[PDB]
Amino acid sequence: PVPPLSVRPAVVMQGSARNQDDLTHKLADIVKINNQLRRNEQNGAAAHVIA
Amino acid sequence: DAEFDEGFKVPGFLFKKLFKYQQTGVRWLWELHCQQAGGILGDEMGLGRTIQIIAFLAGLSYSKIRRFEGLGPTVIVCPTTVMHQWVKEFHTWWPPFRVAILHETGSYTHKKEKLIRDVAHCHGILITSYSYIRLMQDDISRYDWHYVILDEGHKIRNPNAAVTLACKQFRTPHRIILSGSPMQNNLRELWSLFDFIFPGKLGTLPVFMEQFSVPITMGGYSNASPVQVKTAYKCACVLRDTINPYLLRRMKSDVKMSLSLPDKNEQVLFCRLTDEQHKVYQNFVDSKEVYRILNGEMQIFSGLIALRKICNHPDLFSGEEDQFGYWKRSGKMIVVESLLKIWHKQGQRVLLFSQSRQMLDILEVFLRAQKYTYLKMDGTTTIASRQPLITRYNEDTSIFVFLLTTRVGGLGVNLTGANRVVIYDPDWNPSTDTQARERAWRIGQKKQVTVYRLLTAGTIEEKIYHRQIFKQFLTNRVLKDPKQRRFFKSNDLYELFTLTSPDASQSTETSAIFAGTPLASSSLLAKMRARNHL
């Protein structure tokens, strides 16, 4: 379960740079490796790579 | 009428029209049909593969071989630019096939699913685009198709694309691919094509990679240990004989004596960077961005695109006689100036290619700065008006240079009136630049055509050309002969964020690399021990 935006608000700094929450960065890592694993299982990858 | 072994009465008044290689191909297609397997007509362009397919399907329909009384419903998936051509081919060879196109233009004027249902109900010949396979992948695959022909089946080159999945969702044992090149970049593509035509032969993609692709490429480097190259050769042989009875590929070497072919010469010009361009490229390769690329913290791909832009022209990367795209600020356009001037004085006609459409527009502005008459066709031009442009270039001489990117237009748009061709910048794919040079030099070319590939030495672009040659070598080893002289180094080939422009005291990197230029259980055992000692 990925929480809503209220639990991880993207606070805007003095300028326009929108800083993301720690939860959002972590979910970014999770989605990155999840997609990476999904393609590695779908396409050519070694068993140790998938592991 | 010609007759085959089990009985396949290809009609005489068609079979006589074919050429010898064409009849061999019809034989092979029917051998597959008996085995109930698929295959790849890997004959490169210009031999005529559509003729073989219509010939075989017509023979299969008239012969009434049987499931289905004769030939059942068949789907042909081809690019849009050739569908109408296909239906015309059928209608001129074998009229009684009720051929029908699935398209917005079409002829049905009603619900398209009703077209699928009707055509399947009449065992017709249905032609689609790849996009319609992808979109109606669930609907179109319910009517028990008897043949699937993926014309230009290299659209299936990627085993991840949705078009590949949609095409592999067909059920029939009969899958034929008509591709001029089954593999273009690496062995991902060969496996995908074979997973289509014959789902099991080559293993699952992981197994196929770890058995073939890695040992092979590791044996494609000149610094490989002897064991590595020997293993690469052995695995290449195994793959070659594994794919042998399902890939029918014929070159323009055996069939050359049947059709004429004017000589083609090709050069690779190495264009020194201009001092401002040189400074910009050196600043980029010394800036912190490429350092972060080497750290892996940023995606290397922007660095590639930036360096390609720099080598094309500084105005791309950076952004009178000082307006946008001034041709003196990059050496490749200096060379293009010289060649265009000389060729115009010679009265010839030019094809001017480039992967980038932005620099295609730069070059357009440059041609306006000169007095050359020209014509442009790119992706921005509407497709419905593409044919007129080509015809107008081909019919007259009052147009000098035609502007292309390597990938616009249907495969092999007929640009015959051109005499000289220039590839302004190389691409990663060998097949696209090969297609670029092939587009001018086709069947029915009157004059000797020469290709000039423009390189910037010591830059990213030299490395792009090296990679193109490497992939070409890989494909050649897989498809024509495993034994090959090794040209390249692993680290030099892969490291591509440096600058060593030649000073003419030392030769260029490319020339330095190319410096030289029943079984009786004993034959079975002999072949096994032979393969194993390698």
Add this chain to the structure above:
Amino acid sequence: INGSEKVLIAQEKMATNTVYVFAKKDSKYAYTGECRSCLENSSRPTSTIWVSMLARG
């Protein structure tokens, strides 16, 4: 530093190259003699060596 006046606070630490025999009440060792050793011109951290006596029983 950046217009900000910064003052370095002297930091206490146990002297080095000296043998110190302590006795921890709650430990397997009755007595422990430690020596945080460091070469004259520092190039590595303090390498602590202990020489202990196992507690009786």
Add this chain to the structure above:
Amino acid sequence: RHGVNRQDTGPLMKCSFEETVDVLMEAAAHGESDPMKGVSENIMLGQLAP
């Protein structure tokens, strides 16, 4: 925590004291139900404490 969070006081009262995550995770794994009898539970839910 070894005496106060080992009685049947309800997961929300216990998470207020100590081991917030462990308590709530144990209650999730075992489907425990807080009857909202104590003052902590009502205070968290903004309800009038009994």
Add this chain to the structure above:
DNA sequence: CGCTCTGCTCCTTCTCCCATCCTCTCGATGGCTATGAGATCAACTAG
């Protein structure tokens, strides 16, 4: 007469906790991959 089933003790992880509230300053934080061609399709812009 050798196996099982305890169940006691010693060690070893292992994991949890460490008063309340309040004021101020100071430093660090900033995330960007492209490009083009083909095909679809739906809306005009004419017929």
Add this chain to the structure above:
DNA sequence: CTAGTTGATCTCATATCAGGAGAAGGAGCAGAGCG
């Protein structure tokens, strides 16, 4: 109704030290039935 043009949309390529306290597990092992 009929083409044709022109946008948007999407797919597919090419890149390689001055804690402490308690609770749980595990292991060594003494010993008692008892097969």
